[PDB]
Symmetry: D2
Subunit: 266 residues, 4 copies
């Protein structure tokens, strides 16, 4: 008798125990969801990580850049959930931007930007095209986003990728609505993941690290209810809220799991 009791939900984006998707999968499992998981490249690494989730879930290989993976996805999912069964939810927690994109903004070559927008924005439509035929009416497609309304230091082309992702969602909703399915994004505040901690520790340089740290601190002071960058649970709960039947008139939208920071100047 959980929030997602009996729902069949696909969750992508697990790579480490710090991934937002890991906590999405954990909360959803605690809430009665039967999950199908997607992973990219490091499959043996992902299997080991996912063994720590409350329940066992079938792991599938999915590179969003691979057209053959996408074409075979619906088949590979139906084979995992059972014939005659469909998905009730889909979670997109996929994002990437080469080193040059997140180095000055003018120094990122288009090849790097294009790979970033492919994986971070275009993939949301790729996943929808492939999974909507095997989704039930009342279904929910959730994507992971960060507020790209105003420009910020260090994130550069990843912010551009988010602006595109938000636009992609708005169109996915048009297609998803034909199937009785909702399409929405969760705009989260900064969450200290492996990539987030490394960059803050000066992996992408000192100027990048200092800027990210000021962003994080500014977030907790702006957020009326506070913001804990070490806690992905408030984000994971919000995604489950969208996967549930408790937001039935919300599509093409963005739900801000940011502590209320986007609503405050200072």
């Amino acid at each position: 008798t959980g929030l997602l009791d009996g729902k069949r939900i696909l969750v992508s984006g697990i790579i480490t125990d710090s991934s937002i998707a890991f906590h999405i999968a954990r909360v959803a499992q605690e809430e009665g969801a039967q999950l199908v998981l997607t992973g990219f490249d490091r499959l043996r690494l992902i299997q080991r990580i996912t063994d720590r989730l409350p329940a066992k879930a079938p792991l599938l290989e999915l590179d969003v850049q691979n057209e053959e993976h996408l074409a075979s996805l619906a088949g590979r999912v139906t084979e995992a959930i059972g014939a005659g069964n469909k998905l009730d939810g889909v979670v997109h927690s996929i994002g990437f931007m080469p080193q040059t994109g997140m180095n000055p903004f003018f120094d990122a070559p288009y090849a790097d930007v294009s790979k970033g927008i492919h994986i971070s924005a275009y993939s949301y439509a790729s996943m929808a095209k492939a999974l909507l035929p095997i989704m039930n009416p009342g279904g929910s497609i959730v994507g992971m986003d960060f507020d790209p309304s105003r420009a910020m230091p260090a994130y550069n082309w990843m912010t551009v990728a988010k602006s595109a992702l938000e636009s992609v969602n708005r169109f996915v909703a048009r297609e998803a609505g034909k199937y009785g399915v909702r399409s929405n994004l969760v705009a989260a505040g900064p969450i200290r993941t492996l990539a987030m901690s490394a960059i803050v520790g000066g992996a992408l340089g000192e100027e990048a690290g200092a800027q990210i740290q000021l962003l994080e601190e500014g977030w907790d002071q702006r957020a009326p209810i506070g913001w804990n960058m070490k806690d992905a649970t408030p984000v994971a709960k919000t995604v489950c809220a969208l996967l549930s039947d408790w937001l039935p008139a919300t599509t093409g939208d963005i739900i801000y799991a940011d502590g209320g920071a986007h609503t405050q100047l200072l």
Copy 2:
């Protein structure tokens, strides 16, 4: 084992069985909530209406224009829920704008506009000031709104009142956060209430009625998942979603229960 199981929630704004608040109260009761209700002026009428809710709830008199009602509210609530007990949720479903405000836009006198903004926008802060001292950490204040981003025909000063209400919410969140309480609004699409049907039937004139009907129709065509103006249940579910613990990092915000219409041009 419901969404709001064991939560003590105050619900204002019930006047008829078509009121958005009636359905908010119904869904919340179905979800395990113990409710305290507020009514205005026509108390014998409201008692009769509320007798149709799944469970009995104490009815309290509250005119948001009455400073004595607001000052005595916390006391009257604690007396109803029991000493030592606090509220876990508050619902604002209060709105009014004299006939002249919703007649040309330039013809509404300030006395009429001021009464409208008092009841429709200022009251949200009045309620918060009075009920936050008797609210528990993790609490939720929800208000009823409609998207006032772009101007529209016939709604005129009620749209202005909504623009103010959205701004009020953003500040209420600053105060509510001190108490561990969230403050948010639900921006709903058109819902055929008694006031809504009367105005559409030419109560406020022909030009007003025709404009409202075009608004309603335009809403269903824009909304990717459709929009049923005769169904307040998708709205009522969204308010309960905010009263729950499933949106814990959302404050000073607006959740659109509009079928996705605000995200689409046409």
Copy 3:
């Protein structure tokens, strides 16, 4: 051969040489505009101030709370510009919020808030209703605004008044368009006026003063082209740009003269 050469423009809101309107009037006069000015209560004070403008302009008494002043305004203006002549532009640089409104947010009584919204938001429509019948096609109504999208400390009910003003503008544009007239707002960054400097110097308290100073500093760091709070000339130029024929397809809108700060997170 200036930007507003031969244009007849009404300018309200001059009280001191630090008023945004004083600089609006100065730039417009430098640009070939023949001006009609409105003042409130301290008429002998305003006459003395306005004597410092590049050219002499007729001063008119206008309290926006006075219904008789508004009703007699068109007549008093036509008598000043000459019979058969009309206004080509109108400038609204009027704003007020009692001490309690800008003291905690919950402590402001409605009487104080209502006076604030009357003078700061409703007056924009009052002025439009009165001056549109004496405005020429191609005309321009400009109002002074500050970004109320996100809540901020100390400004409280003045921010709410701005949110309402922006909504009012959107409706004024509907009425103004019938006359071939544009209606827009200029959202300026902080400008060190007499009221602004006093409040920063601890007139409205220490917490208020400290918050305003942090707002000002944060503005210059966010603004890509910088922000000089001691210089109202960039604001005054933007208002003239809207009074000109160089923004002919912009109405119901907001032009941000803020140094680009609203477009940047940090």
Copy 4:
């Protein structure tokens, strides 16, 4: 004694006499600007078109996909305007999206989308990187945009490209501010160009054509001051307003030359 008297402005995007850039160049020339023009591929066609501008202007070859063109651009411009002279303005009126991108939204392959985002969004930063070193303090970079806030039929991936372009602008402003240069976009309503008329006449199909026509009609009814899709002059004037010194505190922003349509629901 014009708006841009003595200003040296680069204008890209001229292909036909119906191109928004042709009218931008015409108005700017009428306003005292000395222009440098860029063209793509069909150089003999562009030279013939540009011969109809009020004054002769040097034409330069610039494919935004060509890294050698961008690297040699500053040199080729300085050689055209004269050594020691710099640009005071830059106009980006470049946009493209393959046939599949504007066919269902899910059917556009990434190769087509990537080419579109390259030419329509990334190119804005490419141009800025190359031309900022040869731009004077007080300079202005203007880009052509359409409101991508809400999704619409038929435009699909071109809308996504615009959402990215708006984000790109916000970052370009950060870099441009270092040089004392402003960076802004002009969001125009539909303008009947050769590509616009062809698509409306059923070049991209019937469903696409019908949708574009409904968009155009809906624009004129929403716009308080009206909207003439056959007139690019109001757009061209707005770009010149941004190239002027009359909007000195506006950067990373969007100016809507849409007749006020984005501010109105219906």
